[PDB]
Design a protein around this nucleic acid. Sequence first.
RNA 1: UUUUUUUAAAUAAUUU
RNA 2: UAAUAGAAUAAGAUAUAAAA
Lengths: 314, 70, 123, 452, 391, 297
Amino acid sequence: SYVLKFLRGQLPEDLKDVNGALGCLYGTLPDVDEFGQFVISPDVVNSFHQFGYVKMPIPVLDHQQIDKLADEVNELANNVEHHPKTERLYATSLADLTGGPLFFCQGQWRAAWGMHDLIYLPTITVAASQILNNSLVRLWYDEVFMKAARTGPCVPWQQNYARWQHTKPVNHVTVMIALDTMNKDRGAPCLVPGSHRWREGGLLPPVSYDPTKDEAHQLNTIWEIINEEEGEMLMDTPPVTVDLRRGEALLIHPLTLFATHGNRSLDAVRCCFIHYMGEKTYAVQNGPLLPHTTKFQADAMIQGPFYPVVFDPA
Amino acid sequence: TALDVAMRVNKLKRLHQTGGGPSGKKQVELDAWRDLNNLTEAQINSAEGKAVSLLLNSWAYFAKYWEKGA
Amino acid sequence: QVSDGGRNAMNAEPTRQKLRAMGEQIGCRLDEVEYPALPVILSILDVVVTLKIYVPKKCLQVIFSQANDMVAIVMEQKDDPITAEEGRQLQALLSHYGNDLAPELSQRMKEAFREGVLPDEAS
Amino acid sequence: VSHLSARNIATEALQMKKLHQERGGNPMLAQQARRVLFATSIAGQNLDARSVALLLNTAVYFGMESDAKLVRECIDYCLKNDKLITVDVLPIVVTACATLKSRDAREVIEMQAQKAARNAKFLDAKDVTNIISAFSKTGINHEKLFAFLSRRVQTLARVGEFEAAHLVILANAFSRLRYRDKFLFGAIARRAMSLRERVTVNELVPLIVAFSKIGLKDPKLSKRFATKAMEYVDQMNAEQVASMFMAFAYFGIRYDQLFGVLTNRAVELIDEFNAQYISTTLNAFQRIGINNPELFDNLAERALAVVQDHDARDISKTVTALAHFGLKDEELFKRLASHAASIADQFDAMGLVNTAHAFARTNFLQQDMAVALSERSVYVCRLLDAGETRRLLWALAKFQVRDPKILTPVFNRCLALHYDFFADPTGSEEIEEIFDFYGPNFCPPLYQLYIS
Amino acid sequence: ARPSALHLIFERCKLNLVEFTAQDVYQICTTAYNMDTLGMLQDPDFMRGLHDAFRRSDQTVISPFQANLIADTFRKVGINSMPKEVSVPEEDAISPESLILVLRNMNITKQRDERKINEVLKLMFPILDEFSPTQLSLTVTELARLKSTNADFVGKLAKRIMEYNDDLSALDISSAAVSLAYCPGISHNILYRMMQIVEERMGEFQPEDYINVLHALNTLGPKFVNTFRKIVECGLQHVENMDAVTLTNYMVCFSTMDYKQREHIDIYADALVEVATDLSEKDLVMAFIALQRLRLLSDTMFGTMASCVIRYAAKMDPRNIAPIMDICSTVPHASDHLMKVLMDRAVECTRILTANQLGDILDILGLYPPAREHPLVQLFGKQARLRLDLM
Amino acid sequence: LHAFVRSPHYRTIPSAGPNGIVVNRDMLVHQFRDFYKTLQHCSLVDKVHLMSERPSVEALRVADQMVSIGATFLEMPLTGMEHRATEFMESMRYVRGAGGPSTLASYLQDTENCRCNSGDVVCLPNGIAVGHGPRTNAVAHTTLKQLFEVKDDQFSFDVFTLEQEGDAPPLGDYFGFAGSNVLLTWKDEHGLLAVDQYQQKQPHTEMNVVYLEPGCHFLSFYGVDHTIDVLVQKGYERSMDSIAAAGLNPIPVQWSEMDKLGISMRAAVLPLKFFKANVGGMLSRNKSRGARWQTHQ
RNA sequence: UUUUUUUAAAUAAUUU
RNA sequence: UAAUAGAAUAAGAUAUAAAA
């Protein structure tokens, strides 16, 4: 068609249509024969497959990049001048136009620069592909958590695979990146070692969420969903809280128990999750897996513009 | 608390800045080192801004005179 | 809106006269009104002078006396926006119609020019 | 790039924009400019109004939205320092804020509109054209400012202070705003006539297009434009041929001596026709009403080899034009239906309805396009007129679609506009077809309104 | 290396777990800028936390320049910081001091706001009498720096300043003169009276006062030439010992005023070129231009000035290549070495020259014989072809 | 140097100028277009500004507002142009827009019974020359002399009074200096009288005198730039030959209709000299007007 | 071929 | 405890509508 002379350089209405990656954070993606620099050591892979989690030895982002990403997260929750492309989001805590002490966002890779770029970050996608047995890895979705200062709540015990029951096979991983320095007094991730292999790769019953209650009970509700043997393994290996720097990344199994603490510092705390999924993955029902997305039928392979292939071992 | 030790270390640092004292400036540095390492988790977990700022000022000032970095 | 060289050019001059006549009807009754601000007086006087309407002396005296209080307030209070060009225009209009109409306004107005109370249009 | 101050960054950003919007769209220059502008900040440094305006303009042109920092800092500066934005950097700020739609952008645009309204009498040749084009980019309805600018343009053009490019810019700017003023366009036409040979074909075609778009209904200048264009046919490009086809269909007057030569030149360059040119030509022929099968066969044949090049707009226009004239091309129709099924998410509010109705009017039903368009109708139901809603409902009834998740939005839209729905006579027959399929069971209130 | 207590304090400050007032952050930043023993500037996770502490504190306690200094020391590391804007005082917070502080804050931290200026001026008028003589001069200076167009209020302030002629000193008189000359719309009556006051108290002036008066007279224009006369007569007895910047200002005023008594011009130029070697790049450029405009470049004049400028010729600013290039023309003296070095410097910076500067350089070198056999012609041709859109 | 002009108002153009002579409005518009184009083609004028049309024809006389003497922009007394005050404010807005002075000097307006007009002053070399006619009184002479006349070995400014008769037009219309040493005067009685008085007042003065034909309006931008462009009327060819013979550049301009209404070339343009305020010791760049590298070639 | 203007304007009506 | 300034510059199609 004919694009007006002052609209030639614009981007699509949503960044999903943009094939490839923009050069915003780390420039252009490396060449085909340049992807071996970002490989990770086998011991990290063994640690993940043993504990159900591991920390990447090197921070994945420079401090300027973390500053830019924190600015994007701040602008995603303006609440006075709402973010453009807000209608391109799977779910938002500002749908009520009031917000609260916890701001959670999903599918923001179609909304802002940099967040879309972070998906194709080589250092994390190569590691996730190595965890997923060297196959094509497709983004499942992102997530952003922002907790206010002195009142931020905590999300209790949960399993990631409990939210993805519409997807047939167990082939996933999660990468969590800290956009601000975190510790047990501000949203630290607390995980149980060796919990991804408890119920023969099964899902534990959901926990009871009662808001407006102290963090101690919220984190102690764990003794309600487990059995005696899981209790003994808990006693041997109590849940461990992990400290993260301003750029450090953490790989988590989909099936390991996971929680985050409250925020009792004097500033808001930010973190970002991205879930990565393997090639051989099918659907179970007929329809869209996420709101306003391409619909699948029976056991159809999951592809499309909504689940782009981020890395290819060929 | 920690404010008292902070201001006494500040007094020591002023004494070193002006003169050297009856015993000497090296002895002043040693006393400042001991007083600075006296702090334990309780106070530094409950210190306010002024005390922390003064403690960092004194430690940074005395790090130039100490042979080791500290 | 009258053209001196159009289709009805020969009818241009009488129409002009008619307009001037209907101006005077308005111009004669110019003392009953109360001017809130100087630009109203200046617009009326520009209209009457440019178009050469005849105005009786009584309404002229009322107009100038009304303007005198406003300029005196502006000069004296100095704490409260008569620009300098508007004041120049008022002085020139009074001079054209004769300074015997309001002797106080001429002296006050000249003194305002001398001191510099009136600001400029740029400010 | 670190040793460059903000002034040099602004100059190089302007250079990159000028190189990209004119000499090709090299996907390298755009991405380099995006990367450079993503790491710049107007903070802690004193900058002129022009440099800040240039940075804002070149940032917004390259996709940066109203959530970016650079944009926020430039907008804040433009809000705080208003008297520093003279009449030289007003067009840059207005053009930059045209596409941004927020509170601050609206406030800045209004303030600049009032500033240009006050100083409309002291502008010169460059400023009037730049300001009027910049205000035509944004959608604003300040009539008094337009009147003042048109008066100043007439006063300037009486003495002859406009060139061919200025005339084209002014004509397009005043036609885009739907400001119908006979004297201004007469003055522009007379200035071009005085220019004589200084207007070439490239500076003549947009003049005719804009003069047709404004719709003055003056048959005195249309004939003169046609006569002037008759000599320049042999030098025209294919895009120019399509542009004059559209323009003289917009005029509405029949000039056979011109249409014949245009048809011959269009046939000569049939190998240079893209899909856009074919769609434009067929739409122009549909609008003017002439029926010329000889050119139509060649257009249809050339459209068959560029199927993959078709956009949503081109598919819609081509299919509607082909269906109006009763031309049958089963291969072209099948390929267009498949392609429309592939890109069903690119149809706008009215293109979808036009495509569906054009496909349903002829007896051509294909499930691939039918399912895609029926599913896509949900997101464009809310932007439809009463007649367009009736057409969409009839086309959907022809496709035999019964999914309630599709039919609820269209029935809601047609119920909300029932008066205009049932007051259009030309569609009355269509109404009796629609309820012949769904029956009184489907949406009883609509049936009760129909009986009355 | 951070020991246990030092590491724990660093961690506490890193986690935003300590409440910091503006004073404490200022003290820590001063310590960091003074001494680098603990590596404060080398820990991004520490200065980021300090910046977060600074944003959420009350910055109104400290002086404007302290906030500016914290902002500058954060900018130097790599953190984009800006101190918060001060709100206009309301209700009983009204006072001359706070109304001066608003302007001072807007001045130092580079946050100009026309709306806040207008609001402040509309609220300082009634109490103009209560103001002290020094506050009047401070307000005049602040309004002159902010490029305010409200010349009426500046004139009122200037009149109230003149009413206290006895109280003011030479420095205050010079500051008032230059700050009045900088305002564009000031009425010429007040300007005439201020230059009349400057005309007396002439012997009390210091080199800073001379610089201020010469700046004001250069800004004003030929209309005040008479006053400038008494200046050149006044300095005729000190000319053998003056600062180089003062003589450069004298040359600039001589060129602007179109002075015609040539003996003073010759004496002052002769005194200037004795110490011209002490001038900076900019002042050297302007001495050269002013001497050229007065038709005083003899052979020794040009030789000495070229020898002085060849030192800065290695790293000339782009804005200074063209003027000296023009001065090298229109004179019948040998300037081959200066021309060659300037052409080399022009070649070096061919990717940063704006369109106007490139056009000026190409124009000046158009008729130069030795400029044809150089890479500059081809490089500038390519640059001009690229930049034709911006010309 | 900025030159200001005003476009004619076609609808309200007078049918028959004073004296009953006839005028053609289309030709008047065409001749003003030709004048504007000729002004733009002049190299010395940096910009030509065109103000919006005003209802009266007298608004075409924009030169009556003020006068430029040295660096002083003196505003003429508003004693006979009361209906033209608003036009003067509108012209001052145009002057301010182009970066010129904020406001005009009001020295003449404050003085009483100070009748004068722009046009009786000639910016002669080494001062101005004023004419003592009916339109200007002796009070204007005395006020101008006190304001601008200074006697010095070098800071010298000369004001000359030149007596003229009642029927003589304003001095600028017929007596004016051109080039650098050339005095252009109408081969009329008033022109010869003015030339003789100027020669006498200033004795031992050497400057060529050129006599044009009567009725040949002319305009010359007199300044240091020594521009030789001298605009003259089209009809008279002998004045054109005389100007060319003195080493000048006559630029023919059709000036029939404007002449028929009583307006001359000098009364139709407003020339002003602006500058940019230079904060701090500063020497703004100036455009060149000569040749470069004379010695090399 | 040419045709245009320069107020502080404040009185609608309703249960939306 | 903290205050110095320079530049004048123009790109161009959104699928509508009654009378010298």
